[PDB]
């Protein structure tokens, strides 16, 4: 295997067009990519 949780500080969101993105509240960034697919 299962996905497991987003790492601490990360939140999943959807934009105004319906596109999924990921927010890191520790480093104050956003990115398209699920940090779990980046070994975080």
């Amino acid at each position: 295997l299962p996905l497991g949780p987003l790492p601490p500080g990360w939140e999943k969101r959807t934009d105004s067009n319906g596109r999924v993105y990921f927010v890191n509240h520790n480093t104050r960034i956003t990115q398209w990519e699920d940090p779990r697919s980046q070994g975080q």
Binding site: D15, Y21, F22, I29, T30
Partner: peptide
């Protein structure tokens, strides 16, 4: 292109 700015989405 890129996702919303952090400070726009909070």
């Amino acid at each position: 292109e890129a996702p919303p700015c952090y400070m726009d989405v909070i």
